[PDB]
Structures are given as C-alpha cells and as structure tokens.
Design an enzyme around this catalytic site. Structure first.
Site, PDB file in Angstrom:
ATOM      1  N   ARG A   3      36.482  50.323 -60.154  1.00 50.87           N
ATOM      2  CA  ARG A   3      35.514  50.736 -61.157  1.00 50.87           C
ATOM      3  C   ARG A   3      34.544  49.586 -61.447  1.00 50.87           C
ATOM      4  NH1 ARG A   3      38.550  51.216 -66.029  1.00 50.87           N
ATOM      5  NH2 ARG A   3      39.454  53.127 -65.120  1.00 50.87           N
ATOM      6  N   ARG A  64      35.940  47.130 -71.583  1.00 47.99           N
ATOM      7  CA  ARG A  64      35.535  48.228 -70.693  1.00 47.99           C
ATOM      8  C   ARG A  64      34.003  48.463 -70.775  1.00 47.99           C
ATOM      9  NH1 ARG A  64      40.098  47.979 -67.805  1.00 47.99           N
ATOM     10  NH2 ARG A  64      40.639  50.153 -67.285  1.00 47.99           N
ATOM     11  N   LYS A 100      42.750  46.786 -74.773  1.00 51.89           N
ATOM     12  CA  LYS A 100      41.380  46.943 -74.309  1.00 51.89           C
ATOM     13  C   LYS A 100      40.378  47.310 -75.416  1.00 51.89           C
ATOM     14  CE  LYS A 100      42.526  51.243 -71.684  1.00 51.89           C
ATOM     15  NZ  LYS A 100      42.528  51.630 -70.235  1.00 51.89           N
ATOM     16  N   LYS A 102      36.540  48.905 -76.353  1.00 53.75           N
ATOM     17  CA  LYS A 102      35.461  49.794 -75.935  1.00 53.75           C
ATOM     18  C   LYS A 102      34.226  49.742 -76.881  1.00 53.75           C
ATOM     19  CE  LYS A 102      38.490  52.604 -73.288  1.00 53.75           C
ATOM     20  NZ  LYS A 102      39.073  53.940 -73.016  1.00 53.75           N
ATOM     21  N   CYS A 319      39.824  64.675 -67.670  1.00 57.36           N
ATOM     22  CA  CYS A 319      40.031  63.357 -67.058  1.00 57.36           C
ATOM     23  C   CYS A 319      40.525  63.556 -65.608  1.00 57.36           C
ATOM     24  CB  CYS A 319      41.082  62.548 -67.810  1.00 57.36           C
ATOM     25  SG  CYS A 319      42.731  63.261 -67.550  1.00 57.36           S
ATOM     26  N   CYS A 325      46.167  59.622 -60.658  1.00 58.85           N
ATOM     27  CA  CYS A 325      46.688  58.919 -61.811  1.00 58.85           C
ATOM     28  C   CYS A 325      48.222  58.902 -61.851  1.00 58.85           C
ATOM     29  CB  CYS A 325      46.126  59.483 -63.101  1.00 58.85           C
ATOM     30  SG  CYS A 325      46.505  58.416 -64.514  1.00 58.85           S
ATOM     31  N   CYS A 364      47.187  63.423 -70.015  1.00 67.41           N
ATOM     32  CA  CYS A 364      48.319  62.869 -70.732  1.00 67.41           C
ATOM     33  C   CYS A 364      47.767  62.314 -72.052  1.00 67.41           C
ATOM     34  CB  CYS A 364      49.025  61.801 -69.874  1.00 67.41           C
ATOM     35  SG  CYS A 364      48.329  60.137 -70.003  1.00 67.41           S
ATOM     36  N   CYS A 368      42.180  60.100 -71.947  1.00 65.70           N
ATOM     37  CA  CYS A 368      40.956  59.791 -71.210  1.00 65.70           C
ATOM     38  C   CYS A 368      39.869  60.868 -71.196  1.00 65.70           C
ATOM     39  CB  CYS A 368      41.293  59.381 -69.794  1.00 65.70           C
ATOM     40  SG  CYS A 368      42.489  58.026 -69.832  1.00 65.70           S
TER      41      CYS A 368
END
Ligand code: SRM
Ligand code: SF4
Ligand SMILES: O=N[O-]
Ligand code: NA
EC number: 1.8.1.2
Length: 455
Positions: A3, A64, A100, A102, A319, A325, A364, A368
């Site tokens: 990514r 991210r 993380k 964002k 997602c 995944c 899940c 996402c």
C-alpha cells in the site's frame, strides 16, 4: 499486501501506468484495488519500493494515508486543502504511536472521507474562496471486538478552530499527547478514542494547546450534506471537468467484456491532469479540458467504466476481507455485488429505486469497510453470518446500534425487506432510512458510544 502513501488520493497518470504494469505482471491477482483511504493495494506480491520510488512514490510508522475531500463543490478549494493534506502527511512521518493514527482534511459540505472514523481531522474553513483555517475534530475510530463491551466505535470530538498557520504544530501536538497518554499496557485500548474518554476531551484539549503554543478559537460553522462521490461529469474551474468513475469494490481488473484495467491505462495515456482515488473506492479523472471530454468519455464508456448502476450501488461499500485478509470472518468484497443485486430488487419492489441507503459490509469487527458509520452496517461474525447494525445517518455522524446478531444473508434480506418497506411508505419528505429507523423507534440511537453503544 502493498500500500502507498498517497495523501489525498492524488496520483499522476505516469504513476498510474507504473502501478498498472506491476499489478498486471508481478502479482497473483493482477488487479489494482483502490481502498477507502484514497490509496491502492496489490494482492499477492511475488523491489516494489524501487518501482514506486522511481515514479516518486513510497510505501509508508503508525501513520496511515491522510485523506482529502476529492471533488469539492467549490472546485478551487481542492488545491489548497490538498496542499495541506500533503504537508501534514510529510510532517507526521518519522515518535512511536501506541496504535495506528488516521488523519484527514475535509472540505465541507462533503464528508466523503468519513471523518468520524479518524483520530485527527482538519475541517477546512474558507472565506472568499480562500482557506483561512481549520476546525479540529479528534478521536474517531470504528474498531470493536465482538462481545467486548470495553471496545467501541466513537465519533470525533470538536476541539476548536485554528488559523492556518498553526496547522502543523497542532497536528504534532495531538500526535504526541496521544503517544504519551496512550494506555501503556493493552494495545486494544491504545487508540485516541480511548485516551479521550479516559482523560477527558477538555484535558486532552488543554494539553494540545499547551504543546502547540496556541489557544483554540471557537468552532466556525460547517455542515455536511453527504459522503458520496459525484459520479459522472462535474464542472471544475476554468474550462476543466472532472469525471468520477464508479468502480465496484474499487477492484480494477479486466473482466470479460469490461476491460476496466485496460480502459484506465488507455485514459492514463491521453489524460492531461491526474487521477484521484476517492474515499469511496472510486476514481476521478481530474482536470479534463472541455475539449477532451469526448475522448475520455469514449474510452471510459467502451471499457465499461461508465456502466450505469443504481444510486444504491453507488452508496454501498465493503472491505477486502477474503481471500487475502487473514482476519476475515465473513465475506465482504466478494459478497457485496450479489447482495446489492438483492437490495436493488428490494428498492425496486418498494418504489424507492431512485433512493439510496448508505450500506456497508465490514468483513470483521476491525471495521475497515466503515460499517460502523453506515445507516445499515453489516459486521462479519463468522462465515456467512453478520451482525446487522441500523441507525446511522447519511452524513456519517452517528454510530449504528446492533439490531440483529449472527444472522445470514437470507435473514438480513428478510429484515431489510420489511424495514425498507416501512421507510418507503412512512418516511417524511427527504428523510433518510437511518434517521427513519431512529424516528420510527426501530432502533434506539447511539448518543454516547463509550457509554451506550452496547445493549
Ligand atoms: C483495504 C482496506 C478496506 C477496504 O476495502 O477499503 C483495509 C484493509 C485491511 N485492514 Fe483496515 N482497511 C481499510 C481501512 C480501514 C478503516 C477505514 C478507514 O481508515 O477509513 C478502518 C476503521 C477505522 C479505524 O481504524 O478505527 C480500518 C481498521 C483496521 C484495523 C483495526 C484498527 C484498530 O484500531 O483496532 C485493523 C487490524 C489492526 O491493524 O489492528 C486493520 C487491518 C487491515 C489489513 C491491513 C489486515 C492486516 O492487519 O493484515 C487489511 C488488509 C486486507 C487485504 O488483504 O488487503 N484495519 N481499516 C482499507 C485500507 C486502508 C488504507 O489503505 O490505509
Ligand atoms: S474489516 Fe476485517 S476482514 Fe475487512 S479488511 Fe479489515 S481486517 Fe480484513
Ligand atoms: O488498513 N487498515 O487500517
Ligand atoms: Na467503489
């Protein structure tokens, strides 16, 4: 799994041809997958850094991709807002984050970047077509753990307004406070949404002003009217136009009779300006001179990039999930098309085929696919089973409460058939489905996620 760091989703036509080649000859899947964070992903990488670095691209560090409203109604505002998104991005590049982080730059009235799913948000405030500052919103995050009432999705909190000049010091201050005050023990509690609730918004805010060297001014007015992309041609500044292409699941691949991947290569070769990957997994061929509209449009049309879909399909998202995944519990990307085929039938049946419900499926609980900010969200619980959430709104400022748990598609469908039916007949003028379920008492609203998200 690769990514890119692509602030604002802006990618050049030169860079596109580079990722097009690699995807096609160096990956198992041969596709380009546009993500909901305005960047792309390769699936099944069999060096990529050189291929990226050569076209001036780099792979990301708990930071991210910084998002930026892609197609503002006031087209002239994008350039500045995008400049700031790119500045914040390089400024935040390596301190270690407990979890993380964002960030986004939003241009009201559009909330396409879904600011409430992010830690740090800069809502652009303009005067006379010029950006003068930002309202800072902090603390969004959608990740939850099934059955763990200690986890929750939370919306961003308003801190205040700040002049443009204080942007970078404020960004750095939020990051660092969070880093220092982040729960040291458990990682599942190391997110900014948890810290805020623990120390308090005012406490966190005061520390941020202290570290930044500023005092937030009161929030300046801003409103959002939607989150969808502006599918089709929209007039930009001067003689330029922007064609946003709807790409289902953002999966760019040549399908039989629908060479989506080749089409984008073709357009890339003759396109003046660049492309913009949207937060809705779509692509904008930006800055097309009026003189070029017919060229560009011919290619997109022939490649199947402009096939018309219902407004429902355009406002639905899922997602990646299976097959790539590892945390996937249920299908998301591969379940959405036929699932929306069924929702389309249902919308038709009730005479609401021209309407839309922001519907999202996340594979899940990590969240996402941003189902936790949708009007109707599906959260995977196991193979073929999802928790059905209802009650979000069109603009994405409300978390939907769980309505049904661990149910299958046939059961999800039966429930929506009934609800959509009630909405088609009892809704007020212009009333969204989400607000409707809340107004009609079908679902209690989530007014304070940290305290009332779970029943
Ligand atoms: C591709 C994408 C979904 C999509 O179809 O668009 C996605 C895909 C993945 N996400 Fe995500 N997330 C995507 C947006 C987000 C969002 C939405 C957003 O950012 O706007 C969220 C919810 C908001 C939030 O973070 O609170 C999200 C929350 C997570 C989490 C949970 C984080 C947490 O705080 O608990 C994980 C798992 C983790 O890292 O803990 C994760 C993990 C993953 C990984 C990287 C799996 C892994 O850990 O190895 C998934 C890769 C699947 C694959 O095979 O490609 N992803 N993920 C988006 C890629 C974003 C990007 O390019 O940077
Ligand atoms: S929500 Fe779960 S299944 Fe979907 S891409 Fe994210 S981690 Fe994987
Ligand atoms: O890529 N998930 O944040
Ligand atoms: Na899409």
């Amino acid at each position: 799994l690769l990514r890119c760091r692509l602030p604002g989703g802006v990618i050049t036509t030169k860079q596109w041809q580079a990722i097009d080649k690699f995807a096609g000859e160096n990956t198992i899947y041969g596709s380009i997958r546009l993500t909901n964070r305005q960047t792309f992903q390769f699936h099944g990488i069999l060096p990529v850094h050189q291929m990226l670095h050569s076209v001036g691209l780099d792979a990301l560090d708990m930071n991210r991709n910084v998002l930026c409203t892609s197609n503002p109604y006031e087209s002239q505002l994008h350039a500045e807002a995008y400049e700031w998104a790119k500045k914040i991005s390089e400024h935040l590049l390596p301190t270690y984050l407990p979890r993380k982080f964002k960030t986004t730059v939003v241009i009201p009235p559009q909330n396409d970047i879904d600011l409430h799913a992010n830690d740090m948000n800069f809502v652009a405030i303009a005067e006379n077509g010029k950006l003068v500052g930002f309202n800072l919103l902090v603390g969004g995050g959608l990740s939850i753990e099934h059955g763990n009432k200690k986890t929750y999705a939370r919306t961003a909190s308003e801190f205040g307004y700040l002049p443009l000049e204080h942007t970078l010091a404020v960004a750095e201050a939020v990051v660092t406070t969070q880093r220092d005050w982040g729960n040291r023990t458990d990682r599942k509690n190391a997110k900014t949404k948890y810290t805020l609730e623990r120390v308090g918004v005012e406490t966190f805010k005061a520390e941020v002003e202290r570290r930044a060297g500023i005092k937030f001014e009161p929030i300046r007015p801003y409103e959002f009217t939607g989150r969808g992309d502006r599918i089709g041609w929209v007039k930009g500044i001067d003689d330029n136009w922007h064609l946003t292409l709807f790409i289902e699941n953002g999966r760019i691949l040549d399908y039989p009779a629908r060479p989506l991947k080749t089409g984008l290569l073709e357009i890339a070769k003759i396109h003046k300006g660049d492309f913009r990957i949207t937060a809705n997994q779509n692509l904008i061929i930006a800055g097309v001179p009026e003189s070029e509209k017919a060229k560009i449009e011919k290619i997109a049309k022939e490649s199947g990039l402009m096939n018309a879909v219902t407004p429902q399909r355009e406002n639905s998202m899922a997602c990646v999930s299976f097959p790539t995944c590892p945390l996937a519990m249920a299908e998301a990307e591969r379940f959405l098309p036929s699932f929306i085929d069924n929702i389309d039938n249902l919308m038709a049946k009730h005479g609401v085929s021209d309407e839309h419900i922001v519907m999202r499926v996340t594979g899940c609980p990590n969240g996402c696919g941003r189902a936790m900010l949708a009007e109707v969200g599906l959260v995977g619980k196991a193979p073929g089973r999802y928790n059905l959430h209802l009650g979000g709104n069109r603009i994405g400022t409300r978390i939907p409460r769980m309505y049904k748990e661990n149910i299958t598609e046939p059961e999800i469908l039966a429930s929506l058939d009934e609800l959509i039916g009630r909405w088609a007949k009892e809704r007020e003028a212009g009333e969204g489905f989400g607000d409707f379920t809340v107004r009609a008492g079908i679902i209690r609203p989530v007014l304070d996620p940290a305290r009332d998200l779970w029943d």
